[PDB]
Design a protein around this ligand. Structure first.
Ligand SMILES: [Mg+2]
Ligand SMILES: [Zn+2]
Ligand SMILES: [Zn+2]
Lengths: 1337, 79, 50, 49, 99
């Protein structure tokens, strides 16, 4: 068994000879009649083997009497058959041919070896003419074509000392000639003398490459083919059909082609034919080879009479139709079934239907073995005939066998784990599968013609997994997020919401009950109202003492429904639980609380009884809909007459040649909107409490029985928008442009539609539908590419003994808290001693599991940031420590080693991603104000205005939480200064839409400077008012004469000097950008707060965030600190001369100057500071900042995008998938290894755990971190197997084999593809057995 | 024991380990055909495997000891 | 004859089916009249009239 | 199609999601009960024997 | 319809999909990788060797389940050695690490 690793190197022709069992010489396959093998063709039975076993063709020698005998009658060996799968032939060629993937693949592995270019050798081998096979005199070069009339000069010059003729043999001899060693050691010897610049690094490239081939062990001669194996017959079969028609694999075609051309070449070379035909035959042989190797890549594909091209070998490994994706990873199943589904309303949780027909079909082996055991069917003829005749015992024994015999259930698409579960059978003669209605949601399944599929645990590990793991009763929480999956579907909730209700109108007000018994006696007798708050007695309990119930009774004036319900409650809770009208939120929290304190089993029976009861009385509750449940409001004609008069006025306005259309058109839409929103009011007023039903009085009105508001209130179906679109206007409607129609839906469904309103709705319907049907692929790719990365994490030390790691702060932004820090802290270890807002009140000694005693202790405290020894910050090499991960969620305790995940992440993230694609600063409420890192100014008017783009407003509450978050234009006009307090509901900024003002706080003379007609600007009169100045065009419109120089109308005094900014020694003029149009002329004076210039006016991003593609257009954050200055002057984009304090200046990046900047031409930035208004590449963050800041940036952005959509995932996933991004360690120094070699950060830690230690102080090198993406990490892997599975298998196979790779089969897909166990799951015990063995010698 | 697979885990601590223990135990009853410990109560040997597991009667150490000693005694009967 | 779930008609918005329903109920309204006129075997004058 | 009675209600989980409930009497009339003509064949061909 | 194993192809020799012809249902990588998330490494290898590609696995398993012992013998999918002979017609040394 045991393995470490093994070596590989190229295919010897000796090896194909040894492997093969006989030359194939012919293309011939069979006879025309006697459909039987051909000697020395492709199906040579004497080579590959016979059909029967230990027998010769005559049948002399047989059955291991004559074991290693060859029947000399037919010369046929007495040998066995499973080798028929093995035994290959071979083929000896006329002339050498080469392997295309050593040739056409990127860096060639043969051209990169020689470093002599390609097209040279192409024409050497398209034989433009004679060609230097060997420039014996280096005067002549190899790979040098010599024409029939130029060759003679090489000839009569040297004659002897050159070989300049045709063929692949040129390259053969080349590879055989070149010697790698002494180049290597020489390049080293002169590396030591002067380890030069680019010169030496390419010396070094070669030196290490050379030695890599040396010590790796390689033989680039076998880059070139001389022997060609023959794939066995049954690897490329040829079979008949019923109608005599035959059927084949396309490979035989190419096999025949190659053999025929080769034999014809054997002919032409015996005749010394004119070698032009030998060239053509050589091109043809190499072509047929290369098409066996890769046909449709070279040129126009080869096709039959079909005109369709024919599949090669490579596609049988590659993409879909290869082994991997189609039928090695994903199979067709034995003993399965599937059919249409319907509801089981009277199921228990563990149950499922089984039409006994398919019960029998799948379980015939058990019932047969059992009919033999009893012996009624004495033989299998008897059992099969008895079971065709359907004995009565077949039924009782089918029940016997099926009793306690779990089975799986599968619906397409299997998004996450819970789409497939395992229930107990319930045998039925109903052709429809019955299904416990509550797991309609995990399946996303609703009964509109759906079919489920079914699978059979035969073995006992599978049976017991089905019952312990897939079971309906071990799965009660999403691991995406710890919510219950037991939601009331839509009916028991409607039921309960009806029961525990509290009217005023029906009857039976204020009498007394000793308890819910006479509540049921009354309500089942027909006396009380279920919905009537009537005095009763309760006797709840509580476990106040140490798990010790505490009895008590009391009275509570409560409804008949809550009363009657309360008995279901399992005597541990208070009555306030049931003392409201049971919203489904309450029901979530009910089974929550139930599970929490009780453990679980009550919550089980409890929920069963509640499903039971709500279904029962909801059928007794009655629910329907009527025409008058939607309205004919009394004010229907009057609204029409009013709208009639309004549009008549609009008509006459149009008649005038005034309001012309846009004002008119928008006016018309707005008035229609308001008119039928008033209709909506009329109607919802004319239903809900219109039932005036007196009772013992004058009159009283009460909620009428519409059923629409009720089914809208529980959460079953509907909501205010549904009810308006039935009632009021159906908002506006956008035609396919994305613009918005300005004459709406006026009517509704009851009143009656118009043809074109309908037709406009068809557009939005169709657009949204095509979005739905065409993004299952998008998640498809994102999920599956992420999973193919999937490796694991295993712990090794109790605590790494290491220090702090990550900070925890909650995720409240935009709205309320979205992850309590109470939860974020939950189960983790503290980085450190942590205090309370009563400070120096330590509560951990640097590390404690902070279970909810602590998280609640600290929810009690308003402490607002804590740190955690992170799994990242765990410094245990080749693993982590347990405290740093914190808690196992399933165990609910600090985690134990070995179990690990990450497709869990994939399901959690992808499964919801299916549909979930479809100026001002304010504070809202009281409290302190904590806004900073902004440049702003008290503008001319006396309130705050931004002058650094960074700020985004937040509406902070009195405790401190952000209630709202919104963005703010630079240079805006506020009515609030931050650090004030305001009543919410206020336009804090009344901004001008077009003007972006250019106010001059200074009072100095203006005069036209820096700015001249038709270079930096135009000067172009403001036509409407009529006065002007120098008029600053945008970026592209001005000519490039002065586009290289910033236009700045300048302020001066009577002296001409720089009117410095008031309070500082800084000059004050404005490098005017586009639209900055000054209206008053040269020499004019401006005032304080005076405008020189007036400036008028998805899931794809998910793909972008995950694929690590660069951000795109605009300028970015300060790359490096130190003074930064401007560069090359606008060849489209101007550059940025950075000048770091001690670092290096030369970096300069094209920036849109059209997109205005932040740091001026001689202002300093700190690194990682915004330069402009736009994003930055995350690679800038990893290369510039460390790891925590970058990963924080990414996870921030991505969960903002999701959280936007009403989304929730335990973000542990989004960080572990980023640990799996890339671990490429770009070395900083050299001395131990190369200077910037991509190495295992692991092995990096190893070397520094060896060399930097007293072996040296330091001889080696330090290292950096890297990114560049997930897919290339998939590629960039120890194994090539997991890499050579997915798309572009070809190039991966090339680069795999070229090293002679010999993967050690540890990763997931690695051991998978050979079907042997991998470290965990079922194989966990054996893997850790091997681990203890490795520890135990 | 029938509808849920919790307490057998509360004894052991894992589903993987519970599931494998129930399997190992019931291989000794589907084919070995010797007797259970918890009464039969008309259930397939899933139920009895999990019950034998639940009462504190079966686990991998116990099965190791039983097979080990009864193999040593057989080795001593052979000689 | 049959029972239907009105769970979806607001969310399905097929109100024409509702109108279909009413205009069908009234039509059996006339068919029963003619039924009774049949079993009661009305005079020609009444058949004409009705 | 056919003309017959309707009432719009939930019922004990039998019209849970889009499903249909129905009296026994409509099939005593067979008025929805109906037919499917299907096809079967025999090629009788030349045999060597 | 609900049925059992059906036919196999020729050039890859793999079982059938379509109930009328006794089909098993095909799976994407999604559905095996959910099993990876789950942890049924046994059931994964059962869905890598026996039912589609491997032989000794399915028949060893079949002989065993009727012996009552439901034991696992892993081997190798035919897909793998097929991969090798395919990339070996390309003239590269590739070979089985046969047990
Ligand atoms: Mg459906
Ligand atoms: Zn013979
Ligand atoms: Zn740690």
């Amino acid at each position: 068994e045991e393995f470490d690793a093994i070596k590989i190197a190229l295919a010897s022709p000796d090896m194909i000879r040894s492997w093969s069992f006989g030359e194939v010489k012919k293309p011939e396959t069979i006879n025309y009649r006697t459909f039987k093998p051909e000697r020395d063709g492709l199906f040579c039975a004497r080579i590959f083997g016979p059909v029967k076993d230990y027998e010769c063709l005559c049948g002399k020698y047989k059955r291991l009497k004559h074991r290693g005998v060859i029947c000399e009658k037919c010369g046929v060996e007495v040998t066995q058959t499973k080798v028929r799968r093995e035994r290959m032939g071979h083929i000896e060629l006329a002339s050498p041919t080469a392997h295309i993937w050593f040739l056409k693949s990127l860096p060639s592995r043969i051209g990169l070896l020689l470093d002599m270019p390609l097209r040279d050798i192409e024409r050497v081998l398209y034989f433009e003419s004679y060609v230097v096979i060997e420039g014996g005199m280096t005067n002549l070069e190899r790979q040098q074509i010599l024409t029939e009339e130029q060759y003679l000069d090489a000839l009569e010059e040297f004659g002897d000392e050159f070989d300049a003729k045709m063929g692949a043999e040129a390259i053969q001899a080349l590879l055989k000639s070149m010697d790698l060693e002494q180049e290597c050691e020489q390049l080293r010897e002169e590396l030591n003398e002067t380890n030069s610049e680019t010169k030496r690094k390419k010396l070094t490239k070669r030196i290490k490459l050379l030695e890599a081939f040396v010590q790796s062990g390689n033989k680039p001669e076998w880059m070139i083919l001389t022997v060609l194996p023959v794939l066995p017959p049954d690897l490329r079969p040829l079979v008949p059909l019923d109608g005599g028609r035959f059927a084949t694999s396309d490979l035989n075609d190419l096999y025949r082609r190659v053999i025929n051309r080769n034999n014809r070449l054997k002919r032409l070379l015996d005749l010394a034919a004119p070698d032009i035909i030998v060239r053509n035959e050589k091109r043809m042989l190499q072509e047929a080879v290369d098409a066996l190797l890769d046909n449709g890549r070279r040129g126009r594909a080869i096709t039959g009479s079909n005109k369709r091209p024919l599949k090669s070998l490579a596609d049988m490994i590659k993409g879909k139709q290869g082994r991997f994706r189609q039928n090695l990873l994903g199979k067709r199943v034995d003993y399965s079934g599937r059919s249409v589904i319907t509801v089981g309303p009277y199921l228990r949780l563990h149950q499922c239907g089984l039409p006994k027909k398919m019960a029998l079909e799948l379980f015939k082996p058990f019932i047969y073995g059992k009919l033999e055991l009893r012996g009624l069917a004495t033989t299998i003829k008897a059992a099969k005939k008895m079971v065709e005749r359907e004995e009565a015992v077949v039924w009782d024994i089918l029940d016997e066998v099926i009793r306690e015999h779990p089975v799986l259930l599968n619906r397409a698409p299997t998004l996450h784990r819970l789409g497939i579960q395992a229930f107990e059978p319930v045998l039925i003669e109903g052709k429809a599968i019955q299904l416990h209605p509550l797991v309609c949601a995990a399946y996303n399944a609703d009964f509109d013609g759906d079919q489920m599929a079914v699978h059979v645990p035969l073995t006992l590990e599978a049976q017991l997994e089905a019952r312990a793991l897939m079971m309906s009763t071990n799965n009660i929480l999403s691991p995406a997020n710890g919510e219950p999956i037991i939601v009331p579907s839509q009916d028991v909730v409607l039921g309960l919401y009806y029961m525990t209700r509290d009217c005023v109108n029906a009857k039976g007000e204020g009498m007394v009950l000793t308890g819910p018994k006479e509540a049921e006696r009354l309500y089942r007798s027909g006396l009380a109202s279920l919905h009537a708050r009537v005095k009763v007695r309760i006797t709840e309990y509580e476990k106040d003492a140490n798990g010790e119930l505490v009895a008590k009774t009391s009275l509570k004036d409560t409804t008949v429904g809550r009363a009657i319900l309360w008995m279901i409650v399992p005597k541990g809770l208070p009555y306030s639980i049931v003392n409201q009208a049971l919203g489904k939120k309450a029901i979530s929290k009910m089974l929550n609380t139930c599970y929490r304190i009780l453990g679980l089993k009550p919550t089980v029976i409890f929920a069963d009884q509640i499903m039971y009861t709500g279904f029962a009385y909801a059928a007794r509750s009655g629910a329907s809909v009527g025409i008058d449940d939607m309205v004919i409001p009394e004010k229907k004609h009057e609204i029409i007459s009013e709208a009639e008069a309004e549009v008549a006025e609009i008509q006459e306005q149009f008649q005038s040649g005034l309001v012309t259309a846009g004002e008119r058109y928008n006016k018309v839409i707005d008035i229609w909107a308001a008119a039928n929103d008033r209709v909506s009011k009329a109607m919802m007023d004319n239903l809900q409490t219109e039932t005036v039903i007196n009772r013992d009085g004058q009159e009283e009105k009460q909620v009428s029985f519409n059923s629409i508001y009720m089914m809208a209130d529980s959460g079953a179906r509907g909501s205010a928008a549904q009810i308006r679109q039935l009632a009021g206007m159906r908002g506006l409607m956008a035609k396919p442009d994305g613009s918005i129609i300005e004459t709406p839906i006026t009517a509704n469904f009851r009143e009656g539609l118009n043809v074109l309103q309908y037709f406009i709705s068809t557009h939005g319907a169709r657009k949204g539908l095509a979005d739905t049907a065409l993004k299952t692929a998008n998640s498809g790719y994102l999920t599956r590419r992420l999973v193919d990365v999937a490796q694991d994490l295993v712990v090794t030390e109790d605590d790494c003994g290491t220090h702090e790691g990550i900070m925890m702060t909650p995720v409240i932004e935009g709205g309320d808290v979205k992850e309590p820090l109470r939860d974020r802290v939950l189960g983790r270890v503290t980085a450190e001693d942590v205090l309370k807002p009563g400070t120096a009140d330590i509560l951990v000694p640097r590390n404690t599991l902070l279970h909810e005693q602590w998280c609640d202790l600290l929810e009690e405290n308003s402490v607002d940031a804590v740190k955690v020894r992170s799994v990242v910050s765990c410094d245990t090499d080749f693993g982590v420590c347990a405290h740093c991960y914190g808690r196992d969620l399933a165990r609910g305790h600090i985690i134990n080693k070995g179990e690990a995940i990450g497709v869990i992440a994939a399901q959690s993230i992808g499964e919801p991603g299916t549909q979930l694609t479809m100026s001002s600063i304010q504070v809202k409420n009281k409290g302190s104000i904590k806004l900073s890192n902004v440049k702003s100014v008290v503008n001319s008017s006396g309130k705050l205005v931004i002058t650094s783009r960074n700020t985004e407003l937040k509406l902070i509450d009195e405790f401190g939480r952000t209630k709202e978050s919104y963005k703010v234009p630079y240079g805006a006009v506020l009515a609030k200064g931050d650090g004030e307090q305001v009543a919410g509901g206020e336009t804090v900024a009344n901004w001008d839409p077009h003007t972006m003002p250019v106010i001059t706080e200074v009072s100095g003379f203006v005069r036209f400077t820096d700015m001249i007609d038709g270079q930096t600007i135009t000067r172009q009169t403001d036509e409407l008012t009529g006065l002007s100045s120098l008029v600053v065009l945008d970026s592209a419109e001005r000519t490039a004469g002065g586009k290289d120089l910033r236009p700045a109308l300048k302020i001066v005094d009577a002296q001409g000097n720089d009117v410095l900014i008031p309070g500082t020694d800084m000059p004050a003029q404005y490098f005017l950008p586009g639209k900055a149009i000054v209206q008053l002329e040269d020499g004019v004076q401006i005032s304080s707060g005076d405008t020189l210039a007036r400036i008028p006016q998805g899931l794809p991003r998910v793909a972008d965030l995950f694929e690590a593609r660069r951000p795109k257009e605009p300028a970015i954050l300060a790359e490096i600190s130190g003074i930064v200055s401007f560069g090359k002057e606008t060849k489209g984009k101007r550059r940025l001369v950075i000048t770091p304090v001690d670092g290096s200046d030369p970096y300069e990046e094209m920036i849109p100057k059209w997109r205005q900047l932040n740091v001026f031409e001689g202002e300093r930035v700190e690194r990682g500071d915004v330069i402009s208004d736009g994003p930055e590449a995350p690679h800038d963050i990893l290369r510039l900042r460390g790891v925590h800041a970058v990963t924080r940036y990414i996870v921030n952005e991505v969960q903002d995008v999701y959280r936007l959509q009403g989304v929730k995932i335990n973000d542990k996933h989004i960080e572990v998938i980023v640990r799996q991004m890339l671990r490429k360690a770009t070395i900083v120094n050299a001395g131990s290894s190369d200077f910037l070699e991509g190495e295992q950060v692991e092995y990096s830690r190893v070397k520094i755990a060896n060399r930097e230690l007293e072996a040296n102080g330091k001889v080696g090198a330090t290292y950096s971190r890297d990114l560049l993406g997930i897919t290339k990490a998939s590629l960039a892997t120890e194994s090539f197997i997991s890499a050579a599975s997915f798309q572009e298998t070809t190039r991966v196979l090339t680069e795999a084999a070229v090293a002679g790779k010999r993967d050690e089969l540890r990763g997931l897909k690695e051991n998978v593809i050979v079907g042997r166990l991998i470290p965990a799951g079922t194989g966990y015990a054996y893997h850790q057995d091997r681990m203890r063995r490795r520890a135990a010698g | 024991a029938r509808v849920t697979v919790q307490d057998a885990v509360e004894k052991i601590g894992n589903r993987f380990d519970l599931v494998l223990v129930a399997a190992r135990r019931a291989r000794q009853m589907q084919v070995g055909g010797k007797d259970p410990l918890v009464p039969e109560e008309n259930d397939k040997t899933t139920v009895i495997a999990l019950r034998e597991i639940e009462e504190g009667l079966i686990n991998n150490q116990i099965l190791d000891v039983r097979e080990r000693q009864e193999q040593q005694e057989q080795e001593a009967a052979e000689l | 004859d049959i029972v239907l779930n009105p769970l979806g008609v607001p969310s399905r918005m097929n109100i024409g089916q509702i109108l279909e329903t009413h205009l069908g109920m009234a039509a059996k309204g006339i068919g029963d009249k003619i039924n009774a006129m049949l079993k009661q075997q009305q005079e020609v004058a009444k058949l004409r009239e009705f | 199609g056919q003309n017959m009675r309707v009432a719009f209600m939930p019922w004990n989980g039998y019209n849970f999601e889009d499903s249909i409930l129905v009296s026994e009497r409509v099939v005593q009339e067979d008025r929805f009960t109906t037919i499917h003509i299907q096809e079967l064949a025999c090629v009788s061909r030349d045999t060597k024997l | 319809h609900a049925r059992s194993t059906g036919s196999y192809s020729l050039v890859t020799q793999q079982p059938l999909g379509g109930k009328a012809q006794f089909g098993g249902q095909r799976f994407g990588e999604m559905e095996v990788w959910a099993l990876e998330a789950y942890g049924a490494a046994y059931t994964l290898q059962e869905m890598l060797t026996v039912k589609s590609d491997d032989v000794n696995g399915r028949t060893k398993m079949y002989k065993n389940i009727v012996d009552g012992n439901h034991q696992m013998e892993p081997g190798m999918p035919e897909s793998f050695n097929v991969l090798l002979k395919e990339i070996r017609s390309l003239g590269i040394n590739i070979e089985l690490e046969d047990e």
